[PDB]
């Protein structure tokens, strides 16, 4: 779990396959499936399937059209 926490937050698995080969065996020893080379999956807010423009209390004092 600690290795995955560094990967997602800091970026330990940025190279995602061309690491120093010292960090490789340590990760390979921790998780043997070898799935860390894929990279940490990230959520993209560009698409917005559930985009919900919401006028709350503050946003309702100042708008256009």
């Amino acid at each position: 779990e600690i290795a995955l926490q560094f990967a997602r937050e800091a970026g330990l698995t940025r190279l995602k396959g061309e690491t120093d080969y010292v960090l490789s065996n340590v990760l390979d020893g921790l998780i043997g499936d070898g799935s860390w080379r894929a990279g940490p999956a990230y959520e993209s807010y560009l698409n917005k399937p559930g985009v919900d423009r919401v006028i709350t209390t503050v946003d309702g004092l100042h708008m256009q059209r």
Partner: protein
């Protein structure tokens, strides 16, 4: 005469009669005052609103919590709260009932001193008593050995008890509870364009957290899944008809309990706090304390929290020990149930703080006849 049990928690107030199975009145511990200037004469407006009444009209009020991190900051508001609890929900006369109270461990002593003074002067109660919430929680579950993790709205504390003997030096306290989770969710919700800033909108975020949050068994595994598809997404309807949709915010908000560093606190997660508290007891009672974890309080109602706690403790404890986490379905009211049980025991009737005693000793008597 009939005894009264009043659990004045940070978020909600539980009240009722001793010997009952459930509290009779449960209302939020909020006092609201108008923020706009009135224009229509004849209806009449009160200067303040208390409890459910302040919740209904929250669109024109500012709601102030009289209790913060378990310590009563505003005393006039708490006086009004007790007035309400005594005359508009239970419909009782305080002078004719012995009332019981609860207090979080390791709190300032001025808090309980003022509580005792207020109840013996403003309301003239014939008898009173202040108990530690964890002890009542242990009474409610019908056990005399185990470690209690009571996590309410303001305070999350651990109190290990063995064979009716507590170990005060092992008691932990952490000011990380439901209100901080609500604040963290209010901060995180801005990542999706939803902005809640007003005190009325704080309550809405609280309802969202109550109805849509859960604790993930594997945090990194859960985050990956929500980033891969839209399975975990759910939509909530705002009071004005608009709809919002929250994704990984569902399990990020409660994760502050296990990773306090999200909100800038240096303390350890509640699992590590429980382990540290167990490890500070004697070596001969750790086997029993491992196998009698009792959770109670509102913050322990997130679905799946029991499994995550069991997994973390097992990861911390030695292999040969057996870890059992006890989560009764009525744990939200465990403190009040325990208080009702304690007030109905015959042996306890000799432990009340009578008015006579208070008069002779003074508000200082709360530090002797109470733990």
């Amino acid at each position: 005469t009939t005894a009264l049990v009043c659990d004045n928690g940070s978020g909600l107030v539980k009240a009722g009669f001793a010997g009952d199975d459930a509290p009779r009145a449960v209302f939020p511990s909020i006092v609201g005052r108008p923020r706009h200037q009135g224009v229509m004469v004849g209806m009449g407006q009160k200067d303040s609103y208390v409890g459910d009444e302040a919740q209904s009209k929250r669109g024109i009020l500012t709601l102030k919590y009289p209790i913060e991190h378990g310590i009563i900051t505003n005393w006039d508001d708490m006086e009004k709260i007790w007035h309400h609890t005594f005359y508009n929900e239970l419909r009782v006369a305080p002078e004719e009932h012995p009332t019981l109270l609860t207090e979080a461990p390791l709190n300032p002593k001025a808090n309980r001193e003022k509580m005792t003074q207020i109840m013996f002067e403003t309301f003239n109660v014939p008898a009173m008593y202040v108990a530690i919430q964890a002890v009542l929680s242990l009474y409610a579950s019908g056990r005399t050995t185990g470690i209690v993790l009571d996590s309410g709205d303001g305070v999350t504390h651990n109190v290990p008890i063995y064979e009716g003997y507590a170990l005060p030096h092992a008691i932990m306290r952490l000011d990380l509870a439901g209100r901080d989770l609500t604040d963290y969710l209010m901060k995180i919700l801005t990542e999706r364009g939803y902005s809640f800033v007003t005190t009325a909108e704080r309550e809405i975020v609280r309802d969202i957290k109550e109805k849509l949050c859960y604790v993930a068994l594997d945090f990194e595994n859960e985050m990956a899944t929500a980033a891969s598809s839209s399975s975990l997404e759910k939509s909530y309807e705002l009071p004005d008809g608009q709809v919002i949709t929250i994704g990984n915010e569902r399990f990020r908000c409660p994760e502050t309990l296990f990773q306090p560093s999200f909100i800038g606190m240096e303390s350890a997660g509640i699992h590590e706090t429980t382990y540290n508290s167990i490890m500070k007891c004697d070596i001969d009672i750790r086997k029993d304390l491992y196998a009698n974890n009792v959770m109670s309080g509102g913050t322990t109602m997130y679905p799946g929290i029991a499994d995550r706690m069991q997994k973390e403790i097992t990861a911390l404890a030695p292999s040969t020990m057996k870890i059992k986490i006890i989560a009764p379905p009525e744990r939200k009211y465990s403190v009040w149930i325990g208080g009702s049980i304690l007030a109905s025991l015959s042996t306890f009737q000799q432990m009340w703080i009578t008015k006579q005693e208070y008069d002779e000793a003074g508000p200082s008597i709360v530090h002797r006849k109470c733990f």
